[PDB]
Design a protein around this ligand. Sequence first.
Ligand code: HEM
Ligand code: HEM
Ligand SMILES: Cc1cc(CCNCc2ccc3ccc(N)nc3c2)ccc1C#N
Ligand SMILES: Cc1cc(CCNCc2ccc3ccc(N)nc3c2)ccc1C#N
Ligand SMILES: C[C@H](O)[C@H](O)[C@H]1CNc2nc(N)[nH]c(=O)c2N1
Ligand SMILES: C[C@H](O)[C@H](O)[C@H]1CNc2nc(N)[nH]c(=O)c2N1
Ligand SMILES: [Zn+2]
Lengths: 416, 404
Amino acid sequence: GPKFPRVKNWELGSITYDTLCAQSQQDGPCTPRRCLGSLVLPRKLQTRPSPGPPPAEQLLSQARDFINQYYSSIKRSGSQAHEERLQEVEAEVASTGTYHLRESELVFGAKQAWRNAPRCVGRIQWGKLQVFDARDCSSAQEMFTYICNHIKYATNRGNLRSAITVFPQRAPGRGDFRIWNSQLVRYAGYRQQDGSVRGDPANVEITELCIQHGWTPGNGRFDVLPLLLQAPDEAPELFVLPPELVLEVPLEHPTLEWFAALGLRWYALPAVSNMLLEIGGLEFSAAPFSGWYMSTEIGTRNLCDPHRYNILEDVAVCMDLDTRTTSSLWKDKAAVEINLAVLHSFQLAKVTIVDHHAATVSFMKHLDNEQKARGGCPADWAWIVPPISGSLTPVFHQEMVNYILSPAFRYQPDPW
Amino acid sequence: KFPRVKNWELGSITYDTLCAQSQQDGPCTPRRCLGSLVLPRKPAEQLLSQARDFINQYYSSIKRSGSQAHEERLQEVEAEVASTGTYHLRESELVFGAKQAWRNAPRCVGRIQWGKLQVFDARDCSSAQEMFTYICNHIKYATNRGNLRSAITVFPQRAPGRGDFRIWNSQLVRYAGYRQQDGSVRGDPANVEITELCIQHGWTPGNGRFDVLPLLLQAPDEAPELFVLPPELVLEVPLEHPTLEWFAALGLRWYALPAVSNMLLEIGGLEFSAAPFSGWYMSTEIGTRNLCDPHRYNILEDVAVCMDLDTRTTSSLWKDKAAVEINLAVLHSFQLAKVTIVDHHAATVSFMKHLDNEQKARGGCPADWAWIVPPISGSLTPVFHQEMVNYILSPAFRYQPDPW
Ligand code: HEM
Ligand code: HEM
Ligand SMILES: Cc1cc(CCNCc2ccc3ccc(N)nc3c2)ccc1C#N
Ligand SMILES: Cc1cc(CCNCc2ccc3ccc(N)nc3c2)ccc1C#N
Ligand SMILES: C[C@H](O)[C@H](O)[C@H]1CNc2nc(N)[nH]c(=O)c2N1
Ligand SMILES: C[C@H](O)[C@H](O)[C@H]1CNc2nc(N)[nH]c(=O)c2N1
Ligand SMILES: [Zn+2]
C-alpha cells in the first residue's frame, strides 16, 4: 500500500514503513543494479575540500533546509523569527559567501548529526550531548587546552559523559583547523625490522608522522600517542597528553587468573577526532566527539582482528584449546572470554561501558522512538549488528533502511 | 564506474566487472539502501532475449560459441518461442543452468562446491505420486548414509494458463510446530502454518518437539496430496556435547539434509516452480539460528541454566557462552555420527577461496555480506573483513509466493 520502504522485524513479525528517507538529499553508493552497502568507504561516502566556498546557491539551499529543521524542532515553523532568520542567512551569504550559526543552532545541529549517524548503535543517547562551543579558538595551543578540557569533562573519573567540542568552521581562503589523529587516544604502532608491528597496527601511519614531527618514540605495546594539532595555514604542532588525563583500564578476567598476567589494557574514552561535522552546508573540519565504548569494540575488534592486536591464538593457548582445527571453536571460546574480561575489568574499575546485548536492546528502543518521532531511522545493518554473537542480539532480526541525512558526521581525507 | 572492492584485513583490492552482466533490479536506489531486506517488496521478445542470453552462456561454457550447434540451437529456441510463446531446455542445458543458478546465488556461503551438483531431470513428471517417488530418490541419493552429496531435482516448468507444480513444504525435512492455545508453540515455530496445512489435509499429528512433517505435493490445478516420508529415509543426528554429559539429556536432535523446496529456479526465462535442492549444513544454521533464535526453539536459557550461568544480567555473556557450547555440540554430534557438516570457520575460509576463483574466472562474484557473515563470531571469520558487491545474475534461484 504505502509508497515507502516496508521494514520488517522477523523475530516479532512486526512491520513499519520508513517515510523519513524522503528527507534525504544526498545519494549513497547503491543503484538498482548493485548494492554497495558492505563497502566501508565508497566514493559516495567520502568528501573532498575546495579552497573556495560552495556555490552560494548550493549553500543557501542547504542552509535554508537546516534553518527549517531548527525552527521545526522548537515548534516555530512559519513564525516571524523563522522567516527573519532565513533572511539573515540569505543576507549573510549574499555579502560574505558564508554564514554563521547561532549557539542554539550549533547545539541542535551537533545532536542531529549524531541522531542521523546510520552506523552508530549508541543513538538512544542522542539528546544527551554536551556541546562545547570552541569557535573562538585561534591557535593550536588553544586547541590543546580545549581538547584537555573535553577529556576531563567527558572522562569524569570513569562516569563517562558524551561530549563534542566544535572548532571554527572551514572558511573561504583560509586553512582548516584539523586534528591529525583519528582519535584523541591512540596506541603507537611501531614497525619492527622483521616487518611485524609492535603496538596497534591501525596506527602505524600516524605514529610515524608523530616521529617525523619530532616525537621521541617509546617501544611498548600501549604507548599513548601525542596529538598532532593543526591551526589554519600552519604546520601541525605536537602535544603530549598529561598521563593523568588519560584514564586506562588494566584487563583481567573474573575466573581465569592468568589473564591479568597478559598485561593487556585499553583506554576509557572513545574520542573520535578525524570526522567532519557538516551542518547547513557549513563544514567543521575539527569537531572531536566522544561517548563510551561498547565492549565488542575493544574485546572483539581492537584486540582480536588479525590486523589489530591479534591476541586470539595467545589467549586460546593459555586456555589450552585445540588451535589446530577450526571445529574446536577455539576462536569463538577465546573471543568470548576476552569480551568478558573487558566487561569485568571496566566494571571493576567503575568506568562506563555497555555490552553488545544491552546496547542493541537499547538501540531497538531507539528505533521505536524514532519511528514515532520522524517516521523512520537510517541504519547500516552491517555496522549495527555486533561482530560477535550477531543473531543473539535483537538488531540482527530487524530489517533496516540506510540513507544520508544532514546534519551529518562525514569522513574527510587525511590532511597530509 | 565499476565498484572498487577492498579486503580490510589484507589491504588487497579488486574491481567487480561482472556486475555489468546484471539484467535485473535489486531493491536499492541512490536515495536509500535496502540490502538488509529479507524479501523483494513485490512479452515474448523479453523471453526471447533471456533465452538467447542463456544459450550463449551455455555454448560459451563448452567453448563452442559461434559453432554450427550454437547457431542451430538459437534458431530452434527462436522458432519454438515464435510459434508457441515458450520453449524447452535440453538436459545438458538444464544441468549447466542449475549449476549456474547456485553459482550466482549471492546469499550462499557454500559456492566453492558449485560445479559439483547432481542434477535429476524430473520434467517427465505428471502427478503428485510421481513427484513423491522422485523426492524419495533425491533424498536417498543426497543422504548417502551421511556422506552427503549435493543434488537438485527439477520438476516441470511453469506453463501459461495452467497451475504450477509445487512442493508446499519449505524444506523436504521440517519439524512440526503445534500452536498451543496457551499462546506458546510446541516444536518448530517456523512451521506452524505448514503443520496446520498438513493436518487439515488429513495428517494425523504427533505432540513431540521433533515430529517430522509429511510433504504436501501439488500437481497443476489439483489439491495438494499428503505423503509421509519413510523414517529410514530421514537421517537424524541426536545432539550431545563432548564434555557436558547433561547436554544429551536435553532430548535435542536435528536432521542431516538441508533440502530447500520452495524456491523458483529461473533459467533462460523459463521458470521451475518446483526444483528442490540440497547440500549439507554449516553448523551455525542449526546450532545458532534453528536452536537459539528467540522465535525458533529458543534453547539459550535452558542450556545457560544447565551450565549454571548468571542469567540475571547481559554482561555475564551467558547467551554467548551457551551459544558456543550449542554449536560445539552440533559439530561433535554430526562428526560422531559421520554425517557431513562444515563449521563456519572452514566454510568462510572456503568462500574466500571461491571469491578469488571467481575474480579470475568472471571478474567478480555477487555476494550478500549480511548473509555470508555467520550469525556468531562474525569478525572472527575472514569474510567479515571483505567488501562484497550484491547484484542479480541469471540463471537464478528466486523466492515465490506460497501456493495457498
Ligand atoms: C554514548 C555511547 C556511544 C556508544 C555506545 C556508541 C557506539 C558506537 C559504535 C559501537 C560504533 C561503531 C564504531 C566502529 O565499529 O568503528 C559507533 C559508530 C559511530 N558513532 Fe556512536 N556511540 C556512542 C556515542 C556517540 C557519540 C557521542 C557520537 C557523536 C556525537 C557518536 C557518533 C558515531 C558516528 C558518527 C559513528 C560512525 C563511525 C564511522 O563511520 O566511522 N556516537 N558508535
Ligand atoms: C554444499 C554445501 C552447502 C553449504 C554448506 C551451503 C551453505 C549455505 C548457507 C549457510 C546459506 C544461508 C542459509 C540460511 O541462513 O537460511 C545458504 C543459502 C543458499 N544456498 Fe547454499 N549451501 C550449500 C549448498 C547449496 C546448493 C547445492 C544449492 C543449490 C543447488 C545452494 C543454494 C543456496 C541458495 C539459493 C541460498 C539462498 C537461501 C535463501 O535466500 O533463502 N546451496 N547456503
Ligand atoms: C579505518 C576506518 C575505520 C572506520 C571506523 C571507525 N569508527 C570508529 C568510531 C567512531 C565513533 C564512535 C563513537 C562511539 C564509540 N563507542 N565508538 C566509536 C568508534 C571507518 C573508516 C575507516 C577508514 N578508512
Ligand atoms: C523465513 C524465511 C527464511 C529464508 C531463508 C531460508 N534459507 C534456507 C536455506 C536455503 C538454502 C540452503 C542451502 C544450503 C544450506 N546448508 N542451507 C540452506 C538454507 C528466506 C525467506 C523467508 C521468508 N519469508
Ligand atoms: C567489509 C565490511 O564492511 C567491514 O569489515 C565492516 C563491517 N561491519 C562493521 N561494523 C562496525 N561496527 N565497525 C566496522 O568497522 C565494521 N566493518
Ligand atoms: C534482517 C536481516 O537481513 C535478516 O535477519 C538476515 C540477516 N542475515 C542472515 N544471514 C543468513 N545466513 N540467514 C539469514 O536468515 C539471515 N537473516
Ligand atoms: Zn544497497
